[PDB]
UniProtKB/TrEMBL annotation, chain A:
It holds the Pfam family WD40. Keywords: Cell cycle, Cell division, Centromere, Chromosome, Chromosome partition, Kinetochore, Mitosis, mRNA transport, Nuclear pore complex, Nucleus, Protein transport, Repeat, Translocation, Transport, WD repeat. Coiled coil: none annotated. Component of the Nup107-160 subcomplex of the nuclear pore complex (NPC). The Nup107-160 subcomplex includes NUP160, NUP133, NUP107, NUP98, NUP85, NUP43, NUP37, SEH1 and SEC13. The keyword Repeat applies. InterPro entries: NUP37 (IPR037626), WD40/YVTN_repeat-like_dom_sf (IPR015943), WD40_repeat_CS (IPR019775), WD40_repeat_dom_sf (IPR036322), WD40_rpt (IPR001680). This is Nucleoporin Nup37. Its main location: nucleus. It is found in: Chromosome, Centromere, Kinetochore; Nucleus, Nuclear pore complex.
């Protein structure tokens, strides 16, 4: 088990962690993490980006009182730290089945809006517009729902099982990916409000799916114990299927810098949650990390670096390319 | 069963033996049918029923029984529908797979033969 390259202390348990995938106009990479009753927004700078930094410079920028356990965080594309018009916008899902949109100027103006209408737990959410006006959410009510920033439901797709992950297509307009617990991944067009296509996993339950940003034909997921890769439009069947974890895989995320590298996490388990970093050319994980109990997995935008939340700590692994 | 071009007829008889070894038919019943084509029939002495199987003019399966002028219907299962209505929200693939693999929906032998 590799030790984490960097470790940052947190006030409480980290339930979710997400790097800002967008350019905020700052030299540092923005990071959001959700606790039991709060969301923290921080800036991270690494020695690999700036030779004036020894290891990791971690600065808390803002803390938002949430009052509920945060389960998912989505960054808005409008998020900017530019000194002329700073705007922080992100969405959260929590155990109360509500979405909260937070807006801040990083000064005194801190607003949040509550969106209601899911009848079950929300499992995942994303901003599903380049303009950052629309939010997609999925949950245990067997719905995928589309919301404006006004909290009005624009659209609703009835699922055949609980929606487990949702992702916007990185290049193609109007394409939403929805991963269902029974192994089906569906693609929806938000203009026509129609399902375009599905993929099926060989294993169940399907727990997380992500798009490869560097190769928009590739989808990766975790189902049962295994990680699964599809290459579109070649087949509805997996191209690759290999073991990820000895007992239940939970999260899958593609590296933002390398189309052959991805991370998986094991389920919040008695054997301390393993992070496994995989490279498609290798039959085994290139790195196996241990986090004592960790939830959330996110990749840095530029560096070959991933973060996992744990017990009062963030753990960072740099992958040698 | 007497097939005729305009109308079918069933007749039930009892065999009688006189003291002189002379046999005759005693006539028990006569039952008319519609223009349906008779495939098979049997009759039971426990229930005194005639069971009969036909095809109609559209070649659908018709079964009826009668105690030996009204035939009792059997509700035969229809064939699956020609068109499948697919909602604008349903993936066409899921809808067709559900129909095809539905219990009593289809027989493996047909699918294996098409492939």
């Amino acid at each position: 088990a590799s030790n984490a390259t960097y470790t940052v202390d947190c006030e409480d348990y980290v339930h979710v962690v997400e790097f800002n995938p967008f350019d905020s106009g700052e030299a540092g990479s923005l990071l959001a993490y959700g606790g039991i009753s709060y969301v923290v927004i921080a800036s991270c700078r690494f020695q690999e980006e700036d030779s004036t930094v020894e290891g990791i410079e971690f600065k808390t920028l803002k803390t938002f009182h949430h009052g509920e356990r945060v389960v998912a965080i989505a960054w808005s594309p409008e998020t900017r730290c530019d000194a002329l018009l700073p705007l922080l916008r992100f969405a959260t899902a929590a155990g109360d089945k509500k979405i909260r949109i937070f807006t801040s100027d990083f000064q005194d103006k801190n607003e949040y809006k509550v969106i209601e209408g899911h009848s079950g737990y929300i499992n995942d959410l994303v901003f599903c517009s380049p303009e950052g006006t629309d939010i997609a959410s999925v949950g245990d009510d067997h719905t995928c729902r589309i919301w404006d920033l006004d909290g009005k439901q624009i659209a609703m797709f009835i699922l055949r099982s609980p929606g487990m992950s949702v992702a916007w297509h990185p290049e193609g307009a109007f394409k939403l990916m929805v991963a269902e617990k029974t192994g089906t991944i569906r693609f929806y067009d938000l203009t026509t409000h129609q399902a375009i296509l599905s993929l099926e996993s060989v294993q169940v339950p399907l727990m997380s799916a992500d798009w490869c940003v560097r190769n928009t034909l590739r989808i990766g997921a975790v189902a049962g114990n295994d990680w699964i890769i599809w290459e579109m439009p070649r087949s509805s069947y997996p191209q690759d299927n290999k073991p990820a974890h000895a007992d239940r895989a939970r999260m899958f995320r593609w590296s933002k810098c390398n189309e052959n590298v991805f991370a998986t996490t094991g389920y919040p388990g008695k054997m301390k949650s393993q992070i496994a970093i995989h490279h498609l050319a290798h039959p085994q994980p290139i790195l196996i990390g241990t986090a004592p109990v960790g939830s959330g997995l996110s990749w840095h935008r530029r560096l070959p670096l991933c973060v996992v939340g744990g017990y009062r700590k963030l753990f960072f692994w740099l992958t040698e390319m | 069963y007497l097939h005729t071009p305009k109308q079918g007829q069933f007749c039930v008889f009892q065999l009688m033996c006189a003291e002189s070894n002379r046999y005759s038919l005693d006539h028990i019943s006569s039952i008319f049918t519609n223009q349906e084509t008779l495939i098979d029939f049997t009759f039971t002495l426990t229930s005194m029923d005639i069971w009969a199987l036909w095809l109609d003019d559209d070649n659908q399966t018709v079964v009826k029984h009668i105690n030996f002028g009204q035939w009792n219907p059997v509700f035969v299962n229809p064939l699956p529908e020609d068109d499948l209505a697919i909602s604008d929200e349903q993936e066409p693939q899921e809808a067709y797979l559900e129909c095809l693999f539905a219990p009593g929906r289809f027989t493996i032998a047909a699918v294996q033969k098409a492939i």
